[PDB]
Amino acid sequence: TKSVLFVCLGNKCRSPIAEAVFRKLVTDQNISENWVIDSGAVSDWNVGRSPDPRAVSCLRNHGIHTAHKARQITKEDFATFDYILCMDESNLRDLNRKSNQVKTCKAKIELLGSYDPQKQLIIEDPYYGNDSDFETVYQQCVRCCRAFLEKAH
């Protein structure tokens, strides 16, 4: 098996959409059983919370559902995941710093948008935006997730 953890600051908007998009992808390709997929937060502030309703509604528009509840990344995640794919530069900075406080970091830590063929590198926080911003995130996630499944960096 291979494993990937999608991360943003709060684990309520972007990373639960990424997680759900990627889970749909590996189920559609009949290889769900060879993947451990999760999402998590830099911050502990939103722990326990369901995804933003606008993320739920966006996923529903695309026939996808998630049961995810927000959790904070742990030191153990750095030792167990093959890939930690995050949304923006703030996330990358925080994860790289946290990476440096663990003895063994197995995980490669990359921006999810570094996989985008259309080269939009940052998946911007939609929380203060509107439902069109959630849809842009979903579409970016589709492109990046399918590029990552094809070939990892």
Numbering used by the authors: 5 to 157
What did the article's authors report about this structure?
LMW-PTP is a well-characterised phospho-tyrosine specific PTP, widely expressed in human tissues and conserved through evolution. The catalytic residues C12 (nucleophile) and R18 (phosphate binding) are located in the P-loop, and D129 (general acid/base) in the D-loop. We demonstrate here that minimal re-design of LMW-PTP, by mutating only two residues, is sufficient to introduce new enzymatic activity towards four different phosphoinositide (PI) substrates.
Mammalian lipid phosphatases (PTEN, INPP4A, and INPP4B) have a conserved lysine in the P-loop that is important for substrate binding. In both cases, the structures are similar to the WT enzyme with overall root-mean deviations (RMSDs) of 0.288 Å and 0.265 Å respectively. However, in both structures, the side chain of W49 is in the open position, away from the active site, thus confirming the flexibility of this side chain as suggested from the kinetics characterisation. Importantly, the crystal structures of the K16 and R13-K16 designs show that mutations introduced in the new enzymes do not alter the 3D structure of the protein or the position of the catalytic residues.
